[model samples]
Target: EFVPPPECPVFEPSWEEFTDPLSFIGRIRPLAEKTGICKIRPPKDWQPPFACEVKSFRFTPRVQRLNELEAMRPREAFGFEQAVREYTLQSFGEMADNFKSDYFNMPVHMVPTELVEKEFWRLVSSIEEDVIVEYGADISSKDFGSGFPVKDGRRKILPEEEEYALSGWNLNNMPVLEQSVLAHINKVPWLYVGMCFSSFCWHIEDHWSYSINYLHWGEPKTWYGVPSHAAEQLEEVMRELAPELFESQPDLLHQLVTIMNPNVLMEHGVPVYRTNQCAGEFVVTFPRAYHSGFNQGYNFAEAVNFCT
Candidate 1:
C-alpha cells in the first residue's frame, strides 16, 4: 500500500472570490463535488470571529494540563475504535450535560469563556475532557436564545425557504443568514471548542446535507476525508473495525466514531487525504463524504449544514 501525501484539494482565493457567496462556492463546486471536501484559506485581511463579552455567557470546558504528552507522536489516533459506540455515547452525553467542568471542579460559568479558553491551553496544550460549546442547533428552541442575533420566533423556517437564503456561515448579512439559520429545527450555525487533542467522530452531515466549518482562532485542526464515491468502501472498513456502532445507528455513516490513520485507508484501497486547517480557514464537506479529525491546540470553530 502506498502512502499518499496530504493531497486534499485546497484553494486560496482572495476574499473577493467569496463576496458573492454562491459564486465562490460554485467556483469550488467541482473540487468539492469530486473530492467531497476542500480547504479554503481566508483572504489575508479577513478577520476572525469576534470574542464577545463572556460576562453574559457561561461555558464549561473540560480543562487539562498543557504538558509534554501532546508532543507524543501518536496524538492523532482517536481510540474510539476500541469501543466506538460506548465512547460516542459517552462523549455526546458529556457534551449534552454541560453543567459541570470536569477539570475546574467548579461551575464553568463562574469563569468567563475567554478565561476558560486561557486556562484550557495553559493546562494540557489540551484537555483530558474535550470541551464542546453549543450556541445553536435550531432557532426555535431555548438554545436559540441570545449570543446570536435572531428573533425569538420564526426560528423554524421551511426547506423551500432555505434554497433562496444565505448560508448561516455568512456572518455579514444577518437578514439573509437568519433564513438559513432557522431553516429547520436544530439546523443553525453552532460552535465548538478544543484544545490539542479534542476530536469529532467520522460521520456525514445529518440528512445528507453539506457542511462548512471555519476555525476562528488558536492552533490548527486536522481533518481526514474520503470521497463520496468510495464512501461505501470506507464504511465497509469501519463496520469491520467497529461493528457495534452500526448495530445501534443502523448505518456506519451515522455512527460518529472515526480513526484517521491514512495508512489504514490506503491499505484497503480507499482514497483518503489529510489537511491541517489553521485559524481563519474554512473547510467544506460535500454530501456523504466521510470525515473526522482532532484539534492541535486551543481553538473554536463555527459550523453549519445546508442542502445544496
Candidate 2:
C-alpha cells in the first residue's frame, strides 16, 4: 500500500506582489525552504504568451527505462526501445497524443487522474513491467530556444509580451554578481519535453542552487520533494535500502537518480511534501532540496538555476 506525502505550500500572488519575482521569492524563502518545494500561481491576468511555434523547434529525445530501487544506469542492454531519434516539436506532441489514446483506449482527457496515478505506481514497482519512455531534456541551444521570449532584436515582440521578456523569472535575466560566486546558472536554462509517466528521478541541483520550473503548457506535473535540512537523512535512508547504488560511482558527473515511494521516506523519518504543478504556474525548488516528478500527460516545461 502507498501513502502520499503532505501537500506543499502554495502561493497566489497579487499582480503587485508578483512584479518582483526575486523579492517575492525572498519573502517566501523562510517557509518554502522548510517544505523543499512550493507552487506559485501568477495573477489571473498574467498570461505570458507561448512564444515559440511547436512546429519550428527540434531536439533529440533520450530514452529512460523506469526501474524501482536501481541506481541510475548507463545506456544498458535492457532490450526495450533504445533507438535515439531526433523529434520535431509538433511530431512529438502528436506522438504523445496517440500514445496516451492507444494505451487508455479513450480520449486522453477521459482517463481519470486517479487511474493514471495508480497505474504509474503499480507499473514502476512491478518486476515484469518494462516501461520505456522518451523525453527531451537539454539546455537551451541554437536549434531549440528558451520558453520566454528573448530580446535579441531578431524578431518583433509586442510590448505586453516584452514585460514577461524582461521579468526576473526570464531565464536570460542575469543575477547580481555581488550576491554569489557561482557558475553561469541563469544563462543555462533547461527545457524539458515530457509525455505521460515519463519522469525525472530523485536528484538535487548541482552546486546547491535554486531551481524554478515553469510549465509552459499542457497537463499538470506531479512532484515529490525533500527539504534541504533533511537531505542527508534522506540519503542515509536510500543508501541503507540500496547499498549497491552507493558503492561505485565516484565520478564528478555521476549522480544517484532513482524512484522510491515518498511514503517510504516519510516512514523512515524524512519529511516529504508534494504538489501537482499545473500549466502556466511556477514550481520553485529550494537549495539542496531533492525533487522528482512525472508528467501527468504530455507537457512542455523549462527550468533555470540561480543563487541569491
Candidate 3:
C-alpha cells in the first residue's frame, strides 16, 4: 500500500519453450507437470495434520516496544487492502506500530489449515478487504507436500539428480560456485497464505535461479515481476531510496517486514511485469527476477527456491 503497484510484463508461453531447464524467462504455464509442481487436489477426506492446539495461534496486531524485535521490521499499517491513509504518511517503523501481525513460527502441518482459513481473516473481513501471512522458511524437517514432488511406489528422484526440478541449484552440480559465501538458496520452500491486499515485497532470490510456485487453493494472487537485467536497475533505484537496507541484510528479512511499491522502481527506469496466478496455476520466475503481489481474496500458496 505504501508503494504503488507495478506495471511489469508477463509471458504466457507454451509449456514447451517455457520448460527449459536453463535460460531466463518469465512465463505462465496453464499446465502443471507432475515432475515439477504437479497439482494435487484436496484429499478424499481432508483433515489438516496440525501440530499445535488451535486455540491461541493467530495473527493479531502487535504494539508496545516488545514487537520491535530485531527481525520484525513493521511496514505500513492497513485497513482492508488500502494502506491506512495516515499510515501511508508515517515512517517505516511507524507503519508496523499501527498494523497487525502473526508469528512466522507456526508449523503449517500442526496448525489446522481450516482454522487459519477461518480465523486468519478475522481482522479485515468486510464487504471488501484482505491480508496475507508467511509462516517462515523451512519451519519443518518435513517439507509441506505443497512444494516438493514425491516418489511413487518404485521410482526415486534424488535431490542431486537433473530430473529433480530443484537440481539446477544442487550444490553438487555447481561445486566451483561454493565459497565463503557463494551458494544458492535452492530447494528451500516457504508457506504463503493471503487474503485481499496482503502482499509480498519486491525482492530477488539469494542467487539467480528459477522458482516454481503452486497455489493450492482459494482465489488468485496478483503478481508483478522484474527481470534480472531490469532487476539490476530495480536494485540501484531501491538503494537510492533505502540505501541502508542494501548496505547489509538483516533478520527483519525473515520476519516478513520489508515491502516497497515497484512503481517506484519503474519510475527510476526499471522494467516491470504483471500476472494473476489462480488456483492450480504454476507460476515460474526466472533467475534474478523480482516479484511481489497481493491476493485477491482468501487463498493458499506454497513456493520454493531452485536454480538451473
Candidate 4:
C-alpha cells in the first residue's frame, strides 16, 4: 500500500552529518550561502524501480485553469468545498495558513476508510450550501473552457448519489486505497491513495518543515532551486500582479524557485545539482528554499515529511 515512487532512491543522512556547522560549511554551506538550493543523491544501496530520464511536463491549457484557481483562489471550488463544509470556515481559514497559498496546492487530510467514506458523502450533500456553483460554472465554462457546471444545484446527494453525479461528468474514477502516510500521527500505519493535478508554482512547507519527496510511479526527473533573496524578488513581482494574493498566501518570499533550468539556474551564480530520482529514489529539501520538479514524462511522485 505504501508503494515507493517508482525507481526513487532512498537517502538517509545521519544526524551527525548535519549536526556540525563546520560540516554544513564544508558540504552544504556553499549552496546555502550562495543560491540556497541543494540537491543530495541517495546512498548507493538505496534502490528504486524506474529509469532516469529528464523530461519537462508541459502545462496544458486546461491544467492551467486549475492552476490559476490553486494559486489565486484556492478556496474557490471542487474538492475544497468539501474541506470547507467539514470544517468551520474559521478552521478552513486556518488550513491555508499552514502553507503558501499563492501556489496551486492542497493539504490532504488522510483519514480512515470509514471516515473518508462518511465525509465524502457529507461533502457531496453540502455543496449547495457551501459552494458558489454558478460563479464556479461561469469561471470554468466561459473563462477556462474546460470545466462543467453542476445542474440540479438544489439536490443533496449521498455517497452513491455523489458517485453517480461524478460519473455523469466523467470524473468518478480512481483507485481506492485504505491506508495513509499520515497514520503516524494517529498511531496507525497504512498508506492511502488519492489523485490530484496542480499547476506550476513554487512554495515551501508550512512551519518550515523539511521533507523527503519520493517519485513513486512515473518518469524520473530533476529539480531546480532559487535562493531566499531571489525568492523575495519573485514574490514582489507576484504581489504587483495580485496584491490580495500575497496578503492571503503563505510566505512566498521564502519559497519561489529562482532557478528552474539547470544552465540558466547556474548562471544566476547559484549552486544547482542535477540528480535523477527513479521510482523509489527520493530527494530531501529544506524548508524555505525555492524548487520545482521536472518530470521526464507522465509521472507520479510522493513525499514523506518527517520531523528534523
* lDDT scores in order: 0.55, 0.79, 0.43, 0.35
Measured on C-alpha atoms, candidate 2 has an lDDT of 0.79
Q: Which parts of model 1 have CA positions greater than 4 angstroms off?
A: 1-5, 48-51, 61-186, 243-248, 252-254
Worst 10 residues of 1 by lDDT: 133-142
Give the C-alpha lDDT of model 1.
0.55
The TM-scores, one per candidate, come to 0.60, 0.89, 0.48, 0.37
Task: Show where candidate 2 strays beyond 4 Å.
Answer: 68-81, 139-142, 174-186, 243-246, 251-256
Write one digit per residue (lDDT tens) for candidate 2, span 99-190: 88888899988987666766777777776766767778764634455677878775568988998789876766836233534535545677
Predicted candidate 4: what Cα RMSD to the true structure? 19.7
Q: What is the alpha-carbon lDDT for the whole of candidate 4?
A: 0.35
lDDT of 4 by residue, 72-175 (tens): 23464655432222322233224323322222233333322223223322322343333121000011111211111122443344444443334311111212
Question: Candidate 2: lDDT of 11?
Answer: 99
Q: What is the lDDT for 166 in model 4? A: 47
Q: Which 10-residue span in candidate 2 carries the lowest summed lDDT? A: 247-256
Error of 2 at 255 (Å): 3.1
Identify the candidate with maximal TM-score: 2
